[PDB]
Design an enzyme around this catalytic site. Structure first.
Site, mmCIF file in Angstrom:
data_model
loop_
_atom_site.group_PDB
_atom_site.id
_atom_site.type_symbol
_atom_site.label_atom_id
_atom_site.label_comp_id
_atom_site.label_asym_id
_atom_site.label_seq_id
_atom_site.Cartn_x
_atom_site.Cartn_y
_atom_site.Cartn_z
ATOM 1 N N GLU B 11 0.928 -1.150 -0.007
ATOM 2 C CA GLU B 11 -0.194 0.079 0.126
ATOM 3 C C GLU B 11 1.119 1.220 -0.018
ATOM 4 O OE1 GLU B 11 -1.552 -1.127 3.796
ATOM 5 O OE2 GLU B 11 -3.884 -1.508 2.895
ATOM 6 N N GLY B 81 -12.437 -3.220 2.989
ATOM 7 C CA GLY B 81 -13.431 -4.360 2.658
ATOM 8 C C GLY B 81 -14.780 -3.665 2.527
ATOM 9 N N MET B 180 -8.438 -2.099 9.338
ATOM 10 C CA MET B 180 -7.745 -2.408 10.674
ATOM 11 C C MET B 180 -6.890 -1.428 11.359
ATOM 12 S SD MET B 180 -6.780 -6.542 9.452
ATOM 13 C CE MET B 180 -6.115 -6.834 11.266
ATOM 14 N N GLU B 181 -7.038 -0.194 10.741
ATOM 15 C CA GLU B 181 -6.241 0.784 11.283
ATOM 16 C C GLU B 181 -6.701 2.298 11.297
ATOM 17 O OE1 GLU B 181 -4.947 -0.799 8.144
ATOM 18 O OE2 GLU B 181 -4.037 -2.378 9.327
ATOM 19 N N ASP B 204 -12.038 -5.894 -1.736
ATOM 20 C CA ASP B 204 -12.794 -6.938 -1.693
ATOM 21 C C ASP B 204 -13.896 -6.475 -0.987
ATOM 22 O OD1 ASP B 204 -10.584 -6.992 0.763
ATOM 23 O OD2 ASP B 204 -12.671 -7.856 1.649
HETATM 24 N N1 LIG Z 1 -11.725 -7.519 4.357
HETATM 25 C C1 LIG Z 1 -11.003 -6.901 5.116
HETATM 26 N N2 LIG Z 1 -10.888 -6.749 6.480
HETATM 27 C C2 LIG Z 1 -10.353 -6.119 7.150
HETATM 28 N N3 LIG Z 1 -9.218 -5.042 6.513
HETATM 29 C C3 LIG Z 1 -9.593 -4.623 4.993
HETATM 30 N N4 LIG Z 1 -8.665 -4.348 4.386
HETATM 31 C C4 LIG Z 1 -9.135 -4.593 2.915
HETATM 32 N N5 LIG Z 1 -9.969 -5.656 3.104
HETATM 33 C C5 LIG Z 1 -10.324 -5.602 4.266
#
Ligand SMILES: Nc1ncnc2[nH]cnc12
Ligand SMILES: Nc1ncnc2[nH]cnc12
Lengths: 237, 237
Positions: B11, B81, B180-181, B204
């Protein structure tokens, strides 16, 4: 230069009470007006830092202080929720990390262990030498307080008797106790190679019904006991 | 001095590619041998920081850099996500935080809102001015890429179609996407009063079956798109 890290003001107050040559130091480059206390415990240089609750507060403030001072040892003091059953765990007893891990970190889908952050151990190990010094304290019965040594688990929840509790237990069978900051501090310590140990005291037992009431009743006193153990460990450092 | 923060090297690579006057700077006071890149984007001073994954990595490294440099703006770039259904969310689309919050923080037992850290808002608000500049980018169709503006949720798990996904959704109905951040960075920003925004791209969609495969396929490309949007925002800063 020993960094004593606590999450709550009640917990840090029991450390701040026993500092000699105590001075208030202000961090304010971003106008955050953050006060830390610097002093001595039994002739050893100490910074008492209060982070606020949870992983990000603990990481954020531990990191700041580590950037601004030369830290040689990390001690995480404060309250803990005792979870391991039928092993003599009592409110006000001392809990010492041999190891710590998150219960609420999960990249299992990518094959990492439950709680494991990428490129890090699943279980951060407390410092070998700090643990030997804890052994000394136990063996010589300096405190009239039962001390338990084991695995402490961390995540961003106040643990109660909802089924949250049972899945943690099933994920880590040998687990002793929980907290909201311990493995965050262990991760920071790992990054900067600073020896750490978690020294807490049981404020409450999660299995029991209104454990938040016990938590409120015993927070100060469990902080007293954590601070007493911290003092005795510092004696030996 | 604009801090561009990414979790993964893939990234950050899409940011590092577009830096002019790029220099490697080494942080090593604790022998951590941590490399950050400093440079310019369209004449504006930038630090690209790679934190590693999850809340504590993000907090720990954001905090370090904020201690050592004068940071005026925070942009969190990278992959996300997409979770909100029937609202035209597609892999490679851009996601922009109007707000961010944890889904996995819970002191509900003490009366705080779900995701809410004590003494902080449940929802950290991205910077008003950064959001107006995003509006400009949308209105003038600079990118041939759909942009969604909304609530991004953060916790220390890679979100999949297990029933983890549905309880997040039930806790925050209007939620757009996950990472996640993001809220860890927002918390750090809040503490130091630094304007932030999260600028990600969909790698995704969690509802779908093997979303980790899509995540692996599209990580680089979603990073390309996040970086393009970051560039256009910096143009306006
Ligand atoms: N499915 C997901 N869960 C957590 N962080 C992400 N970053 C990109 N896709 C993700
Ligand atoms: N039950 C509990 N959950 C999380 N942290 C704690 N600290 C003390 N008791 C606790």
């Amino acid at each position: 230069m020993i960094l004593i890290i606590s999450a709550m003001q009640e917990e840090s107050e029991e450390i701040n009470k026993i500092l000699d040559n105590k001075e208030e130091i202000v961090l304010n480059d971003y106008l955050e007006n953050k006060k830390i206390y610097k002093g001595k415990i039994l002739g050893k240089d100490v910074i008492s830092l209060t982070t606020g609750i949870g992983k990000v507060n603990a990481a954020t403030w531990s990191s700041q202080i580590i950037s601004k001072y030369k830290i040689t040892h990390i001690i995480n003091s404060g309250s803990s929720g005792g979870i391991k059953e039928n092993s003599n765990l009592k409110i006000l007893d001392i809990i010492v990390s041999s190891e710590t891990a998150y219960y609420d970190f999960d990249l299992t889908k990518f094959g990492h262990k439950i709680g494991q952050v990428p490129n890090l151990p699943q279980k951060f190990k407390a410092d070998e030498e700090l643990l030997k010094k804890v052994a000394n304290i136990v063996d010589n019965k300096l405190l009239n307080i039962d001390i338990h040594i084991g695995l402490i688990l961390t995540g961003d929840q106040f643990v109660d008797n909802e089924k949250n509790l049972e899945t943690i237990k099933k994920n880590f069978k040998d687990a002793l106790a929980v907290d909201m900051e311990g493995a965050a501090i262990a991760q920071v310590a790992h990054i900067f190679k600073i020896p750490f140990i978690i020294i807490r005291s049981i404020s409450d037992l999660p299995n029991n019904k209104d454990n938040h009431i016990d938590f409120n009743k015993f927070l100060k006193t469990s902080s007293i006991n954590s601070s007493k153990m911290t003092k005795e460990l510092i004696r030996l450092i």
